[PDB]
Amino acid sequence: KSDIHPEFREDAKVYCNGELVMTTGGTQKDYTVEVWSGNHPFYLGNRSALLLDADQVEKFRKKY
Amino acid sequence: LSPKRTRFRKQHRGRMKGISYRGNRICFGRYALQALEPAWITSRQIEAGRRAMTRNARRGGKIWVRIFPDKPVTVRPAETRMGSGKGSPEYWVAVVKPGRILYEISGVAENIARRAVAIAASKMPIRTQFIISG
Amino acid sequence: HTRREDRTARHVRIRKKVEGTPERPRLCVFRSNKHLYVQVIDDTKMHTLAAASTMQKAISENIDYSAGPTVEVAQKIGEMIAKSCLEKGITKVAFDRGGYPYHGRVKALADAAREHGLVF
Amino acid sequence: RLKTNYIEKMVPLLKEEFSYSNILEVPKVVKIVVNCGIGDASQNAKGLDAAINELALITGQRPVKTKAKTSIAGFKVREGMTLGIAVTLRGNLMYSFLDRLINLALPRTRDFQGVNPNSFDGHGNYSVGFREQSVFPEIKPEIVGKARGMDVCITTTAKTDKEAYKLLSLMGMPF
Amino acid sequence: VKVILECTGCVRKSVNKGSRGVSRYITQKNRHNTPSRLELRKFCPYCYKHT
Amino acid sequence: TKNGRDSKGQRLGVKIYGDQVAKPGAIIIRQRGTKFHPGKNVGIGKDHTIFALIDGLVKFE
RNA sequence: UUCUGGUGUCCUAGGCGUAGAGGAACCACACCAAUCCAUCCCGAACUUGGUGGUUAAACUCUACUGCGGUGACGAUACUGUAGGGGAGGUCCUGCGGAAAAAUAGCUCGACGCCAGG
RNA sequence: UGGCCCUCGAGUGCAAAGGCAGAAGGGAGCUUGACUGCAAGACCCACCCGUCGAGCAGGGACGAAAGUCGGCCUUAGUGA
RNA sequence: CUCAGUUCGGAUUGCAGGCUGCAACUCGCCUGCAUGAAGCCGGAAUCGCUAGUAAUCGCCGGUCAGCCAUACGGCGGUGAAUU
């Protein structure tokens, strides 16, 4: 229908802070995007947190 | 004894008919009390016969009360007789026709069930007998 | 739920209101994805009077590569169903839509049936 | 553009993974549907306008304020009241917003659970639901101080034990 | 309240074939004024029968 | 002190039975609701009564 | 002259399910776009115009009594008349009619019109 | 809000009964037949009453047409 | 920064340390990071003070291995209004 629907643009520029640009179709023309799923720390964030931070004995030996 | 919910408060009477061909068989229990005589049996005689044969067995076995009243009888007061105003919370009544099993019993030997079923048949306005599970 | 049961349910919905009479027959259509069908039938004797189809006009003007039902072949089969029952004694007819809503090629099919003077 | 990535690579390995015999028996995603569960939108008039403008910029098209199926006592619900504002988008918008669930919901969730093998498991026709990301990053987020409801139900054609979970697994939904 | 009330046409006291005022019984009007198109007046086509 | 005696007196029923000669306009069935649906050569009424359109017998199927 | 598929009508109503088959033709889904048209949003539905592949879904045909529907005979309750018993509740006879439920079975419909090949 | 199952158990301004599943139940468009003059024949029938009605003319409403509409699914809501 | 629960406020909690002392969990202090609670001058009532006083800012001592001391005992700095 006309006159009610928002402008669904085909040229939507997805800009990453790591100098990567991909094309998607959406509302805005430009999208400044953070941690988006390709090269996201979901393989290393669960490696750094809940998997390696727990220590009580090797913390004790570093002060003696 | 008495139904909890009643679909209709007062309900008029209904006349006895021939031999009940459905409720004549024995479902549970080994022995039974078959009625030869069509009349009404209130919940009061059912309490009397139930206490009679439960306390006449008194060691083992279980009885089976078959019938439930499901219809009321409205007794008018002594108020010079014209209306059927309120008689619904008064005594309930079970219709029994011939053939129908009234009581059953199991876990009891021969003559202990003969005195159990036969003594508890004296608490009852209609002539009966005891029936073996054939 | 499905589309075919929806069409059949719409056609039974239409059939309650319109009935074939011995004075006025009823012509029903079927717009299959390859072919149209049109049936001048008489319900009180339970037999057809004048049936045509895309397999009748398709001797001369058809393209099976294209989507078979077009508005132009609806114009043509309304033309031949308008001149096929006129030579039989069928002037005053009771048109129903065949379970399909009227805004389509059945516009020009019905008006094409009106083009040869049929009392619609 | 992920429909072209949907065509040639992730359909034939579902064709040979289940060991079919024909092409069209392989299932596909049918439609997704978003609702905004709101109990107070006749009073909050600018929250319903926030659903129209803001939620119409969340999804592809304008959402629909939903009239009440019945009136339940206790709540402020009458016959025909706005109980949530929903939208049903479908087509290439469907691929574009499951795409926006790959891009805008999978790496930007504070939790790291993703698709769940213990949720949306058993259905007659398999449906996947999420309660996440009340505002997309296209909308200036700090205006709406209310965590409004938002559910995105995906639909499929399959009636199996494997195929929808592998369908979201082949797309950008790790866990 | 359900007030009974009469609809009426445009009067036109004339010497035509039985030309005269036409009022019709109607109900329910506890609202804005509703002229309905009750017709077959003494003049045979008619519209906007007032009150 | 009774809350009764509220009879109605209203009557209905089948007026013309099957294999019987009907008249044009003869009321065949007076009914509450539709126990008898209108077949052919009949008509349904304003209060769902069934009248005959033409002469002849009446049937049920 | 069978199949195919629009169409009905009688119907014991013919359905669910398990199995096998059909894409020459026909019917049906699927992909592309939207000009009339359209969905209180979506070409999901409806419409128009085409690529035109499959039987996957849906239709059609053939089997099964596992459910479902239907359903006996004989009996028996009941009942119309003519009577009899009982204190009552109520029962029994002569003749006529005759159940219901259950069971043995029956049923995966049957007849017509028109257009291909 | 999405999907399967049972398929009429929901609903119909209100009491019950009989109805009604591609509906008489819910929605949307246009609407004023909630007209005029009537009316063959029926039911109910102490009378008074009361109920249904094919069909005709005028002038229309909807629909593309076929057709339908003389208030409401019906029975109560009244007074010579 | 120039009006905010804020570069106000610092509570509570976590991680990592140090010191004292046989020993620091219940129950010591202190450092480094993390969090940033309540609290926008206080109802009814109520208290101290007539001048180097009030208010305000620090320093020291005692006991003491170390400390719960925001207390106590002192000592200066700035320094009023009112009767």
PDB file of all heavy atoms in Angstrom, chain I residues 51-62:
ATOM      1  P     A I  51      32.566  35.922  77.797  1.00  0.00           P
ATOM      2  OP1   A I  51      32.742  34.596  78.428  1.00  0.00           O
ATOM      3  OP2   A I  51      32.783  37.154  78.583  1.00  0.00           O
ATOM      4  O5'   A I  51      33.537  35.940  76.547  1.00  0.00           O
ATOM      5  C5'   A I  51      33.809  34.732  75.865  1.00  0.00           C
ATOM      6  C4'   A I  51      34.936  34.875  74.884  1.00  0.00           C
ATOM      7  O4'   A I  51      34.392  34.925  73.544  1.00  0.00           O
ATOM      8  C3'   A I  51      35.822  36.106  75.033  1.00  0.00           C
ATOM      9  O3'   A I  51      37.144  35.746  74.673  1.00  0.00           O
ATOM     10  C2'   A I  51      35.283  37.041  73.962  1.00  0.00           C
ATOM     11  O2'   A I  51      36.235  37.961  73.481  1.00  0.00           O
ATOM     12  C1'   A I  51      34.883  36.056  72.875  1.00  0.00           C
ATOM     13  N9    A I  51      33.826  36.534  72.002  1.00  0.00           N
ATOM     14  C8    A I  51      32.483  36.328  72.131  1.00  0.00           C
ATOM     15  N7    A I  51      31.775  36.880  71.184  1.00  0.00           N
ATOM     16  C5    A I  51      32.739  37.470  70.393  1.00  0.00           C
ATOM     17  C6    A I  51      32.654  38.219  69.230  1.00  0.00           C
ATOM     18  N6    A I  51      31.504  38.508  68.629  1.00  0.00           N
ATOM     19  N1    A I  51      33.803  38.663  68.694  1.00  0.00           N
ATOM     20  C2    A I  51      34.964  38.376  69.287  1.00  0.00           C
ATOM     21  N3    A I  51      35.168  37.676  70.388  1.00  0.00           N
ATOM     22  C4    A I  51      34.003  37.257  70.878  1.00  0.00           C
ATOM     23  P     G I  52      38.339  35.892  75.718  1.00  0.00           P
ATOM     24  OP1   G I  52      38.083  35.019  76.874  1.00  0.00           O
ATOM     25  OP2   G I  52      38.555  37.336  75.949  1.00  0.00           O
ATOM     26  O5'   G I  52      39.576  35.293  74.921  1.00  0.00           O
ATOM     27  C5'   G I  52      39.736  33.887  74.757  1.00  0.00           C
ATOM     28  C4'   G I  52      39.188  33.407  73.439  1.00  0.00           C
ATOM     29  O4'   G I  52      38.963  34.545  72.572  1.00  0.00           O
ATOM     30  C3'   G I  52      40.088  32.461  72.651  1.00  0.00           C
ATOM     31  O3'   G I  52      39.263  31.608  71.871  1.00  0.00           O
ATOM     32  C2'   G I  52      40.796  33.410  71.703  1.00  0.00           C
ATOM     33  O2'   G I  52      41.312  32.800  70.547  1.00  0.00           O
ATOM     34  C1'   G I  52      39.658  34.344  71.360  1.00  0.00           C
ATOM     35  N9    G I  52      40.070  35.631  70.839  1.00  0.00           N
ATOM     36  C8    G I  52      40.637  36.650  71.531  1.00  0.00           C
ATOM     37  N7    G I  52      40.877  37.684  70.787  1.00  0.00           N
ATOM     38  C5    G I  52      40.417  37.310  69.542  1.00  0.00           C
ATOM     39  C6    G I  52      40.410  38.031  68.336  1.00  0.00           C
ATOM     40  O6    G I  52      40.822  39.170  68.111  1.00  0.00           O
ATOM     41  N1    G I  52      39.857  37.284  67.324  1.00  0.00           N
ATOM     42  C2    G I  52      39.379  36.021  67.470  1.00  0.00           C
ATOM     43  N2    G I  52      38.899  35.520  66.358  1.00  0.00           N
ATOM     44  N3    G I  52      39.373  35.318  68.574  1.00  0.00           N
ATOM     45  C4    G I  52      39.908  36.042  69.561  1.00  0.00           C
ATOM     46  P     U I  53      39.054  30.082  72.290  1.00  0.00           P
ATOM     47  OP1   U I  53      39.797  29.851  73.549  1.00  0.00           O
ATOM     48  OP2   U I  53      39.309  29.246  71.101  1.00  0.00           O
ATOM     49  O5'   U I  53      37.504  29.992  72.608  1.00  0.00           O
ATOM     50  C5'   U I  53      37.040  30.088  73.939  1.00  0.00           C
ATOM     51  C4'   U I  53      35.549  30.257  73.977  1.00  0.00           C
ATOM     52  O4'   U I  53      35.224  31.651  73.756  1.00  0.00           O
ATOM     53  C3'   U I  53      34.785  29.518  72.893  1.00  0.00           C
ATOM     54  O3'   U I  53      34.530  28.167  73.229  1.00  0.00           O
ATOM     55  C2'   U I  53      33.527  30.349  72.758  1.00  0.00           C
ATOM     56  O2'   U I  53      32.631  30.061  73.812  1.00  0.00           O
ATOM     57  C1'   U I  53      34.061  31.757  72.973  1.00  0.00           C
ATOM     58  N1    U I  53      34.421  32.445  71.713  1.00  0.00           N
ATOM     59  C2    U I  53      33.489  32.766  70.748  1.00  0.00           C
ATOM     60  O2    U I  53      32.302  32.513  70.775  1.00  0.00           O
ATOM     61  N3    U I  53      33.983  33.393  69.652  1.00  0.00           N
ATOM     62  C4    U I  53      35.266  33.762  69.413  1.00  0.00           C
ATOM     63  O4    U I  53      35.543  34.334  68.373  1.00  0.00           O
ATOM     64  C5    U I  53      36.165  33.429  70.445  1.00  0.00           C
ATOM     65  C6    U I  53      35.721  32.804  71.523  1.00  0.00           C
ATOM     66  P     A I  54      34.424  27.028  72.105  1.00  0.00           P
ATOM     67  OP1   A I  54      33.860  25.838  72.764  1.00  0.00           O
ATOM     68  OP2   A I  54      35.689  26.939  71.347  1.00  0.00           O
ATOM     69  O5'   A I  54      33.214  27.483  71.194  1.00  0.00           O
ATOM     70  C5'   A I  54      31.894  27.235  71.636  1.00  0.00           C
ATOM     71  C4'   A I  54      30.882  27.735  70.653  1.00  0.00           C
ATOM     72  O4'   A I  54      31.109  29.138  70.397  1.00  0.00           O
ATOM     73  C3'   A I  54      30.940  27.099  69.285  1.00  0.00           C
ATOM     74  O3'   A I  54      30.273  25.860  69.240  1.00  0.00           O
ATOM     75  C2'   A I  54      30.305  28.154  68.408  1.00  0.00           C
ATOM     76  O2'   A I  54      28.897  28.129  68.554  1.00  0.00           O
ATOM     77  C1'   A I  54      30.825  29.430  69.053  1.00  0.00           C
ATOM     78  N9    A I  54      32.062  29.910  68.421  1.00  0.00           N
ATOM     79  C8    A I  54      33.282  30.003  69.011  1.00  0.00           C
ATOM     80  N7    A I  54      34.219  30.473  68.236  1.00  0.00           N
ATOM     81  C5    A I  54      33.555  30.704  67.059  1.00  0.00           C
ATOM     82  C6    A I  54      33.995  31.190  65.838  1.00  0.00           C
ATOM     83  N6    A I  54      35.253  31.544  65.620  1.00  0.00           N
ATOM     84  N1    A I  54      33.106  31.305  64.844  1.00  0.00           N
ATOM     85  C2    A I  54      31.845  30.944  65.073  1.00  0.00           C
ATOM     86  N3    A I  54      31.313  30.465  66.186  1.00  0.00           N
ATOM     87  C4    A I  54      32.230  30.375  67.151  1.00  0.00           C
ATOM     88  P     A I  55      31.039  24.585  68.660  1.00  0.00           P
ATOM     89  OP1   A I  55      30.148  23.418  68.740  1.00  0.00           O
ATOM     90  OP2   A I  55      32.412  24.561  69.202  1.00  0.00           O
ATOM     91  O5'   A I  55      31.116  24.884  67.114  1.00  0.00           O
ATOM     92  C5'   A I  55      29.927  24.996  66.361  1.00  0.00           C
ATOM     93  C4'   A I  55      30.201  25.692  65.065  1.00  0.00           C
ATOM     94  O4'   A I  55      30.711  27.017  65.343  1.00  0.00           O
ATOM     95  C3'   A I  55      31.271  25.050  64.209  1.00  0.00           C
ATOM     96  O3'   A I  55      30.749  24.013  63.399  1.00  0.00           O
ATOM     97  C2'   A I  55      31.783  26.219  63.404  1.00  0.00           C
ATOM     98  O2'   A I  55      30.855  26.506  62.378  1.00  0.00           O
ATOM     99  C1'   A I  55      31.712  27.348  64.419  1.00  0.00           C
ATOM    100  N9    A I  55      32.972  27.557  65.156  1.00  0.00           N
ATOM    101  C8    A I  55      33.161  27.348  66.486  1.00  0.00           C
ATOM    102  N7    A I  55      34.353  27.630  66.925  1.00  0.00           N
ATOM    103  C5    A I  55      35.003  28.050  65.801  1.00  0.00           C
ATOM    104  C6    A I  55      36.307  28.478  65.610  1.00  0.00           C
ATOM    105  N6    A I  55      37.195  28.549  66.586  1.00  0.00           N
ATOM    106  N1    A I  55      36.684  28.831  64.380  1.00  0.00           N
ATOM    107  C2    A I  55      35.778  28.761  63.400  1.00  0.00           C
ATOM    108  N3    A I  55      34.509  28.363  63.467  1.00  0.00           N
ATOM    109  C4    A I  55      34.175  28.025  64.710  1.00  0.00           C
ATOM    110  P     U I  56      31.565  22.652  63.172  1.00  0.00           P
ATOM    111  OP1   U I  56      30.760  21.773  62.297  1.00  0.00           O
ATOM    112  OP2   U I  56      32.025  22.150  64.485  1.00  0.00           O
ATOM    113  O5'   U I  56      32.834  23.095  62.330  1.00  0.00           O
ATOM    114  C5'   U I  56      32.688  23.613  61.021  1.00  0.00           C
ATOM    115  C4'   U I  56      33.963  24.258  60.561  1.00  0.00           C
ATOM    116  O4'   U I  56      34.309  25.345  61.446  1.00  0.00           O
ATOM    117  C3'   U I  56      35.174  23.360  60.596  1.00  0.00           C
ATOM    118  O3'   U I  56      35.251  22.556  59.448  1.00  0.00           O
ATOM    119  C2'   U I  56      36.324  24.342  60.713  1.00  0.00           C
ATOM    120  O2'   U I  56      36.664  24.864  59.443  1.00  0.00           O
ATOM    121  C1'   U I  56      35.705  25.460  61.544  1.00  0.00           C
ATOM    122  N1    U I  56      36.077  25.373  62.966  1.00  0.00           N
ATOM    123  C2    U I  56      37.336  25.755  63.353  1.00  0.00           C
ATOM    124  O2    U I  56      38.189  26.169  62.596  1.00  0.00           O
ATOM    125  N3    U I  56      37.589  25.639  64.681  1.00  0.00           N
ATOM    126  C4    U I  56      36.725  25.191  65.635  1.00  0.00           C
ATOM    127  O4    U I  56      37.098  25.146  66.795  1.00  0.00           O
ATOM    128  C5    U I  56      35.444  24.818  65.160  1.00  0.00           C
ATOM    129  C6    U I  56      35.171  24.923  63.872  1.00  0.00           C
ATOM    130  P     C I  57      35.924  21.117  59.545  1.00  0.00           P
ATOM    131  OP1   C I  57      35.552  20.346  58.343  1.00  0.00           O
ATOM    132  OP2   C I  57      35.646  20.551  60.880  1.00  0.00           O
ATOM    133  O5'   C I  57      37.477  21.427  59.461  1.00  0.00           O
ATOM    134  C5'   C I  57      38.030  22.060  58.322  1.00  0.00           C
ATOM    135  C4'   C I  57      39.520  22.203  58.465  1.00  0.00           C
ATOM    136  O4'   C I  57      39.814  23.288  59.371  1.00  0.00           O
ATOM    137  C3'   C I  57      40.226  21.012  59.072  1.00  0.00           C
ATOM    138  O3'   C I  57      40.501  20.007  58.119  1.00  0.00           O
ATOM    139  C2'   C I  57      41.474  21.629  59.673  1.00  0.00           C
ATOM    140  O2'   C I  57      42.460  21.806  58.675  1.00  0.00           O
ATOM    141  C1'   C I  57      40.981  23.004  60.100  1.00  0.00           C
ATOM    142  N1    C I  57      40.665  23.075  61.536  1.00  0.00           N
ATOM    143  C2    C I  57      41.668  23.409  62.422  1.00  0.00           C
ATOM    144  O2    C I  57      42.795  23.622  61.986  1.00  0.00           O
ATOM    145  N3    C I  57      41.397  23.485  63.733  1.00  0.00           N
ATOM    146  C4    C I  57      40.170  23.257  64.168  1.00  0.00           C
ATOM    147  N4    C I  57      39.913  23.342  65.467  1.00  0.00           N
ATOM    148  C5    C I  57      39.123  22.918  63.291  1.00  0.00           C
ATOM    149  C6    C I  57      39.412  22.850  61.997  1.00  0.00           C
ATOM    150  P     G I  58      40.830  18.515  58.597  1.00  0.00           P
ATOM    151  OP1   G I  58      40.181  17.588  57.656  1.00  0.00           O
ATOM    152  OP2   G I  58      40.568  18.377  60.038  1.00  0.00           O
ATOM    153  O5'   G I  58      42.395  18.395  58.418  1.00  0.00           O
ATOM    154  C5'   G I  58      43.163  17.669  59.358  1.00  0.00           C
ATOM    155  C4'   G I  58      44.350  18.467  59.807  1.00  0.00           C
ATOM    156  O4'   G I  58      43.897  19.676  60.447  1.00  0.00           O
ATOM    157  C3'   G I  58      45.228  17.802  60.837  1.00  0.00           C
ATOM    158  O3'   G I  58      46.174  16.960  60.222  1.00  0.00           O
ATOM    159  C2'   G I  58      45.866  18.978  61.551  1.00  0.00           C
ATOM    160  O2'   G I  58      46.966  19.448  60.797  1.00  0.00           O
ATOM    161  C1'   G I  58      44.758  20.025  61.496  1.00  0.00           C
ATOM    162  N9    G I  58      43.950  20.127  62.723  1.00  0.00           N
ATOM    163  C8    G I  58      42.600  19.971  62.730  1.00  0.00           C
ATOM    164  N7    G I  58      42.051  20.128  63.892  1.00  0.00           N
ATOM    165  C5    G I  58      43.110  20.426  64.714  1.00  0.00           C
ATOM    166  C6    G I  58      43.121  20.693  66.095  1.00  0.00           C
ATOM    167  O6    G I  58      42.176  20.725  66.879  1.00  0.00           O
ATOM    168  N1    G I  58      44.385  20.952  66.571  1.00  0.00           N
ATOM    169  C2    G I  58      45.498  20.938  65.797  1.00  0.00           C
ATOM    170  N2    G I  58      46.637  21.225  66.431  1.00  0.00           N
ATOM    171  N3    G I  58      45.500  20.703  64.499  1.00  0.00           N
ATOM    172  C4    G I  58      44.280  20.453  64.012  1.00  0.00           C
ATOM    173  P     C I  59      46.597  15.593  60.920  1.00  0.00           P
ATOM    174  OP1   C I  59      47.402  14.818  59.957  1.00  0.00           O
ATOM    175  OP2   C I  59      45.393  15.005  61.536  1.00  0.00           O
ATOM    176  O5'   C I  59      47.584  16.061  62.063  1.00  0.00           O
ATOM    177  C5'   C I  59      48.773  16.744  61.731  1.00  0.00           C
ATOM    178  C4'   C I  59      49.480  17.177  62.974  1.00  0.00           C
ATOM    179  O4'   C I  59      48.741  18.250  63.609  1.00  0.00           O
ATOM    180  C3'   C I  59      49.554  16.115  64.041  1.00  0.00           C
ATOM    181  O3'   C I  59      50.585  15.182  63.804  1.00  0.00           O
ATOM    182  C2'   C I  59      49.732  16.938  65.300  1.00  0.00           C
ATOM    183  O2'   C I  59      51.067  17.402  65.389  1.00  0.00           O
ATOM    184  C1'   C I  59      48.842  18.136  65.006  1.00  0.00           C
ATOM    185  N1    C I  59      47.483  17.991  65.568  1.00  0.00           N
ATOM    186  C2    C I  59      47.250  18.196  66.916  1.00  0.00           C
ATOM    187  O2    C I  59      48.153  18.500  67.681  1.00  0.00           O
ATOM    188  N3    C I  59      45.998  18.078  67.403  1.00  0.00           N
ATOM    189  C4    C I  59      44.996  17.746  66.630  1.00  0.00           C
ATOM    190  N4    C I  59      43.768  17.632  67.127  1.00  0.00           N
ATOM    191  C5    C I  59      45.197  17.519  65.263  1.00  0.00           C
ATOM    192  C6    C I  59      46.432  17.651  64.792  1.00  0.00           C
ATOM    193  P     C I  60      50.387  13.648  64.215  1.00  0.00           P
ATOM    194  OP1   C I  60      51.483  12.861  63.610  1.00  0.00           O
ATOM    195  OP2   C I  60      48.979  13.270  63.973  1.00  0.00           O
ATOM    196  O5'   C I  60      50.645  13.659  65.776  1.00  0.00           O
ATOM    197  C5'   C I  60      51.870  14.162  66.270  1.00  0.00           C
ATOM    198  C4'   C I  60      51.801  14.447  67.743  1.00  0.00           C
ATOM    199  O4'   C I  60      50.749  15.395  68.038  1.00  0.00           O
ATOM    200  C3'   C I  60      51.471  13.268  68.622  1.00  0.00           C
ATOM    201  O3'   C I  60      52.589  12.434  68.821  1.00  0.00           O
ATOM    202  C2'   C I  60      50.996  13.943  69.890  1.00  0.00           C
ATOM    203  O2'   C I  60      52.110  14.400  70.631  1.00  0.00           O
ATOM    204  C1'   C I  60      50.259  15.162  69.335  1.00  0.00           C
ATOM    205  N1    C I  60      48.796  14.966  69.278  1.00  0.00           N
ATOM    206  C2    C I  60      48.022  14.991  70.437  1.00  0.00           C
ATOM    207  O2    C I  60      48.528  15.202  71.534  1.00  0.00           O
ATOM    208  N3    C I  60      46.692  14.822  70.353  1.00  0.00           N
ATOM    209  C4    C I  60      46.121  14.619  69.189  1.00  0.00           C
ATOM    210  N4    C I  60      44.806  14.452  69.134  1.00  0.00           N
ATOM    211  C5    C I  60      46.870  14.579  67.997  1.00  0.00           C
ATOM    212  C6    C I  60      48.188  14.758  68.086  1.00  0.00           C
ATOM    213  P     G I  61      52.389  10.867  69.053  1.00  0.00           P
ATOM    214  OP1   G I  61      53.713  10.221  68.963  1.00  0.00           O
ATOM    215  OP2   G I  61      51.275  10.395  68.211  1.00  0.00           O
ATOM    216  O5'   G I  61      51.926  10.780  70.563  1.00  0.00           O
ATOM    217  C5'   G I  61      52.789  11.247  71.578  1.00  0.00           C
ATOM    218  C4'   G I  61      52.060  11.409  72.877  1.00  0.00           C
ATOM    219  O4'   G I  61      50.910  12.258  72.704  1.00  0.00           O
ATOM    220  C3'   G I  61      51.488  10.144  73.460  1.00  0.00           C
ATOM    221  O3'   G I  61      52.476   9.409  74.143  1.00  0.00           O
ATOM    222  C2'   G I  61      50.399  10.667  74.371  1.00  0.00           C
ATOM    223  O2'   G I  61      50.963  11.148  75.578  1.00  0.00           O
ATOM    224  C1'   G I  61      49.891  11.863  73.588  1.00  0.00           C
ATOM    225  N9    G I  61      48.673  11.619  72.804  1.00  0.00           N
ATOM    226  C8    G I  61      48.667  11.665  71.444  1.00  0.00           C
ATOM    227  N7    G I  61      47.499  11.489  70.922  1.00  0.00           N
ATOM    228  C5    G I  61      46.681  11.339  72.013  1.00  0.00           C
ATOM    229  C6    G I  61      45.301  11.120  72.016  1.00  0.00           C
ATOM    230  O6    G I  61      44.553  11.010  71.050  1.00  0.00           O
ATOM    231  N1    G I  61      44.816  11.020  73.283  1.00  0.00           N
ATOM    232  C2    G I  61      45.547  11.118  74.423  1.00  0.00           C
ATOM    233  N2    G I  61      44.801  10.963  75.515  1.00  0.00           N
ATOM    234  N3    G I  61      46.858  11.328  74.441  1.00  0.00           N
ATOM    235  C4    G I  61      47.365  11.431  73.196  1.00  0.00           C
ATOM    236  P     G I  62      52.525   7.820  74.025  1.00  0.00           P
ATOM    237  OP1   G I  62      53.878   7.375  74.415  1.00  0.00           O
ATOM    238  OP2   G I  62      51.980   7.429  72.706  1.00  0.00           O
ATOM    239  O5'   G I  62      51.541   7.360  75.176  1.00  0.00           O
ATOM    240  C5'   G I  62      51.659   7.907  76.477  1.00  0.00           C
ATOM    241  C4'   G I  62      50.374   7.730  77.219  1.00  0.00           C
ATOM    242  O4'   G I  62      49.364   8.512  76.570  1.00  0.00           O
ATOM    243  C3'   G I  62      49.832   6.322  77.201  1.00  0.00           C
ATOM    244  O3'   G I  62      50.328   5.590  78.288  1.00  0.00           O
ATOM    245  C2'   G I  62      48.332   6.510  77.300  1.00  0.00           C
ATOM    246  O2'   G I  62      47.966   6.627  78.661  1.00  0.00           O
ATOM    247  C1'   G I  62      48.127   7.863  76.646  1.00  0.00           C
ATOM    248  N9    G I  62      47.498   7.875  75.315  1.00  0.00           N
ATOM    249  C8    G I  62      48.097   8.166  74.124  1.00  0.00           C
ATOM    250  N7    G I  62      47.292   8.223  73.110  1.00  0.00           N
ATOM    251  C5    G I  62      46.074   7.963  73.681  1.00  0.00           C
ATOM    252  C6    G I  62      44.818   7.883  73.086  1.00  0.00           C
ATOM    253  O6    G I  62      44.535   8.040  71.906  1.00  0.00           O
ATOM    254  N1    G I  62      43.831   7.610  74.000  1.00  0.00           N
ATOM    255  C2    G I  62      44.047   7.438  75.331  1.00  0.00           C
ATOM    256  N2    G I  62      42.969   7.169  76.073  1.00  0.00           N
ATOM    257  N3    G I  62      45.221   7.514  75.906  1.00  0.00           N
ATOM    258  C4    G I  62      46.177   7.777  75.025  1.00  0.00           C
TER     259        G I  62
END
